[PDB]
Amino acid sequence: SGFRKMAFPSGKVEGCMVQVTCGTTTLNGLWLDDVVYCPRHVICTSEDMLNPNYEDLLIRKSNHNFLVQAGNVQLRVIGHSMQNCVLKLKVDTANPKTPKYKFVRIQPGQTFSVLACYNGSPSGVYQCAMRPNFTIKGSFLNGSCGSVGFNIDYDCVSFCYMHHMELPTGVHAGTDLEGNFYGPFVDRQTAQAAGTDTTITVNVLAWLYAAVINGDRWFLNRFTTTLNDFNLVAMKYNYEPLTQDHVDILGPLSAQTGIAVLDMCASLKELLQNGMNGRTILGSALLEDEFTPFDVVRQCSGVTF
Amino acid sequence: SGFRKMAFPSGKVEGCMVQVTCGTTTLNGLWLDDVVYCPRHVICTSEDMLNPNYEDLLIRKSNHNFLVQAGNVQLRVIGHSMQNCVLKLKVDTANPKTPKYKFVRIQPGQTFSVLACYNGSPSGVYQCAMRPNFTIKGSFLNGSCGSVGFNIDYDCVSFCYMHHMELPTGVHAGTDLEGNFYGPFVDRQTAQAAGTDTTITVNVLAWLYAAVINGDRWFLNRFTTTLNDFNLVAMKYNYEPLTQDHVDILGPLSAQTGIAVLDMCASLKELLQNGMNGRTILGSALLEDEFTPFDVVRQCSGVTF
Ligand SMILES: CC(=O)O[C@H]1C[C@@]2(C)[C@@H](C[C@@H](O)[C@H]3[C@@]4(C)CC[C@@H](O)[C@@H](C)[C@@H]4CC[C@@]32C)/C1=C(\CCC=C(C)C)C(=O)O
Ligand SMILES: CC(=O)O[C@H]1C[C@@]2(C)[C@@H](C[C@@H](O)[C@H]3[C@@]4(C)CC[C@@H](O)[C@@H](C)[C@@H]4CC[C@@]32C)/C1=C(\CCC=C(C)C)C(=O)O
């Protein structure tokens, strides 16, 4: 028992992290097979970042301008290309530590693990969610760009995020591994505000199921509700609307606990309308929304990799 | 910016996890050099667990009764011995993935990362603290025994915890890597209640410094206090008493932020007396106490490994 914000074991990704230096800029890259992926803004100076023309800046760069270092050993760069907002550096050596992997573009509300890195060296690992406004609430300092987010299905690493920027509000923006930003953000130091950070309703419900499984039940009540009735409440509290797809995804937690999804919605409704009255749920004094239904089943069952 | 409950990268420990089977019991072991460490209750049947005589039970076991499997390959056991509550299984092969390591016995209030494992396979990583009552609030299912807790200082893994048991209240008990339990617990299925789970005052103060560094400042007030005055408040709220040693350890966060330690104590005092009035600090609606002063400096600076 016990329920924790749990990251995937990071070893398979640690073996892929390298340092990329272009001119005087250094950040992290991801070495898979014979390609190193990194943010294209590695080619920018401090000056360039206000409105860079990446295609023009890249004309001035050759393979030998990209210094790639894997631990203590230098990699030989034999080609380079820009794909959307990432650079792909072809090296002459396949990473012998390459895990089975895929590139995935996740949906808002999905969770993943981040391996924060500096100078190609891993610093820590933590769990995040793609927020509905397509930011993530990470922990990133200068030098952390190129750190990646990922999920692991047994032996396969699904890479879903590469870190590019911190917005003025302290939240984080980045791309998938094809270099397309999540949300409307651009790799330019300009005014870009984040939209409404709505709460991921299906995740809160999953976490309430986790609470019940782990002994925290005081929030269970005598009520039920309907999808439409619940969603009038969700709207008022800036919660995502709940759909039948969400209900279906919660089925297995319903089955394990014997608590119908709409009954649990009625408990969440009461929690939204009345607050938690100084009580806690799984060690938290607010409603946690960065556990997916899959996350709860995985942690409460013990799937390994 | 941003502040997250962050675990150490787990790769160095993943390479040490093995499966140990004695008879029909299977749990996890830690393979360092040519020794495998695991909980001695691997030799117990379900029956034996009420009051086992481990020395008598071990008489019936030989080297070949301990099946040790590292991934897909079997290890040859060439000796075995009991040290306190752990077994040490000597194998004929040194683990080629052994990191530089030490064994450390941590103090209550210190934090560490746990690599939850099942059948020798890592499942996830998360950050915990040794509570003042010498339990930890983990996430452990049946089969997770032998999973370990650790810190990493650059290249050196300091192992501090091996998981042995879940208490009836859902919290967790275990040993250092010399096999001595933290707290008064025993590897016996009997009545053992946990003591008062007091809050780790110096950690809360560190986390408040982290909040200030990361933009959350609404809890700063116009007041100061004294150690003795603050501790009258700490006592009332089941907080650990604050000592000058604690004050000294917070010096660097004081210096970075320009907020004197006793001023921050006065802010915490007001938070304890008045609550947070529906506000949040670093994404939390309660006062977090599982970040040490060192944890805050590390995350807010970017130390790597
Ligand atoms: C190594 C390092 O510290 O670089 C950091 C620090 C960085 C050079 C930043 C890019 C850009 O803001 C930079 C300028 C010159 C932008 C213009 C002004 O505002 C300056 C006051 C500011 C100082 C440095 C800073 C803040 C970096 C980034 C790039 C982030 C990506 C984008 C698209 C902004 C990085 O993390 O690589
Ligand atoms: C693989 C597995 O499921 O074993 C788990 C499950 C386990 C065999 C447990 C040890 C002990 O409680 C067991 C008994 C027989 C204890 C006596 C009764 O209460 C039973 C209702 C109970 C059922 C199984 C259980 C709960 C295990 C432990 C050992 C934990 C260590 C101690 C000292 C208790 C383990 O995790 O290895």
Side-chain angles (χ1 to χ4, degrees), chain A residues 7 37 44 75-76 104 106 134 158 202 247 258 273 279:
Chain A
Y37 306 78
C44 294
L75 300 184
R76 188 175 298 274
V104 175
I106 57 166
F134 294 103
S158 286
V202 67
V247 176
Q273 285 171 355
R279 306 145 202 171

Side-chain angles (χ1 to χ4, degrees), chain A residues 26-27 41 46 49-50 54 142-143 145 164-165 187-189:
Chain A
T26 293
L27 39 62
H41 67 60
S46 52
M49 295 304 324
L50 290 175
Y54 285 98
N142 288 328
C145 298
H164 288 240
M165 330 184 283
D187 49 356
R188 188 175 319 129
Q189 202 238 343

Side-chain angles (χ1 to χ4, degrees), chain A residues 1-12 14 115-118 121-129 137-141 166 170 172 280 283-286 290 299-305, chain B residues 1-12 14 115-118 121-129 137-141 166 170 172 280 283-286 290 299-305:
Chain A
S1 62
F3 201 76
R4 279 281 188 184
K5 188 67 71 58
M6 189 182 291
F8 291 98
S10 57
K12 286 185 176 58
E14 291 168 49
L115 183 65
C117 297
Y118 298 88
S121 295
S123 177
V125 62
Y126 56 87
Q127 195 71 355
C128 302
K137 293 203 178 275
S139 180
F140 289 111
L141 298 176
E166 184 166 68
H172 303 117
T280 59
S284 179
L286 50 70
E290 294 201 346
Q299 193 177 151
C300 295
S301 90
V303 181
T304 43
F305 307 108
Chain B
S1 62
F3 201 76
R4 279 281 188 184
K5 188 67 71 58
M6 189 182 291
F8 291 98
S10 57
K12 286 185 176 58
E14 291 168 49
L115 183 65
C117 297
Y118 298 88
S121 295
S123 177
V125 62
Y126 56 87
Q127 195 71 355
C128 302
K137 293 203 178 275
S139 180
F140 289 111
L141 298 176
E166 184 166 68
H172 303 117
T280 59
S284 179
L286 50 70
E290 294 201 346
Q299 193 177 151
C300 295
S301 90
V303 181
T304 43
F305 307 108

